[PDB]
């Protein structure tokens, strides 16, 4: 029923971020937010921790007027509060890196929904920032619109949340914040309804 | 019970390729293969249509030393039976269109073991190829590692096939089609699995 067997020792973030673009190499990582997960004593699964960030656009960095003109970030509006992805980043591992002891975990997972986009973006702006001993896994990731594809016949996060019973508010998807919390609340409930049906643990269907 | 109803009319493709190396844009493609899936009238996944290459580095293609020792692939063999990347991919792209049609659904899916680095590869060789009209979704995949990871508290392939029941043999874990073949059966089995204990379709929970 402990975090740390339910995954074989991945410690499993929910992320979401916002950009310029979409390359990961060239384009502005806008906005950034996080979310922990733990087990209570009966191993159900919960949102933990949360952390949330405007980011300022690296230097040199491409900014997309499609994707500005898309997501609605405006990266010169002084009252954005924005700081920089090293700040961002830096506090992001710090929690996990914590959770994960905490926890008996060996390596943090990233929960996303359509996640190789949001991994490929972290992961360049941890290279950016040189920060060492990055906490998650450097390709392996737990993609949400794969695991609502199964668990729910749904791939597209407003209605994967729905079908799910889920509220989804069309006016807040923009934000990395919105989107990573109810991806977490997404993938609990998926994890959760598979052990209440008797999928997990897998001694439980005899 | 349509396999066009199963995942909002996505036709799932399980594929796997070995590589000369870890980039996408610069290593050559060594190996692909593919498996089509369909459900019988009750509703059961099962696989299709099997499909399998040898692939033909291509022209201007890097290779990395350490990949070749890894998966023991040779591409100076002259007895490797490699066709170009242009008629694998072709093929390939001719029986999942002709899936597509006959089972109704409007773009296949790529079904894969940590998915992107496989969709990373046949995207890129699509591309050197110039392929039209490729029948696959450009972005969205379904990783079996992850639905491993949720089914069976597993990310490895070898193990969660073996924690599924499956065999698993590791000699020959370097081969496109072996590891297609075996992802197919647990993708399979993971929908399967879910559909029995009363998880699909959504409304069986209260009959
Ligand atoms: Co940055
Ligand atoms: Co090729
Ligand atoms: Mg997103
Ligand atoms: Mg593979």
Known sequence: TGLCDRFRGFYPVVIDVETAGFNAKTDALLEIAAITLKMDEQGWLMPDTTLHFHVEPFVGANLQPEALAFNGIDPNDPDRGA????????????????????????????????????????????????????????????????????????TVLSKACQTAGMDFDSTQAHSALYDTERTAVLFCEIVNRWKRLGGWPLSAAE
């Open 83 to 154: 700081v920089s992805g090293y700040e961002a980043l830096h506090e992001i591992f710090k929690v996990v890196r914590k959770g994960i002891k905490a926890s008996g975990c060996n390596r943090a997972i990233m929960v996303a929904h359509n996640a190789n986009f949001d991994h490929s973006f972290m992961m360049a702006a941890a290279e950016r920032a040189s920060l060492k001993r990055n906490p998650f896994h450097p390709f392996a990731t737990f993609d949400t619109a794969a695991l609502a594809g199964l668990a729910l016949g749904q």
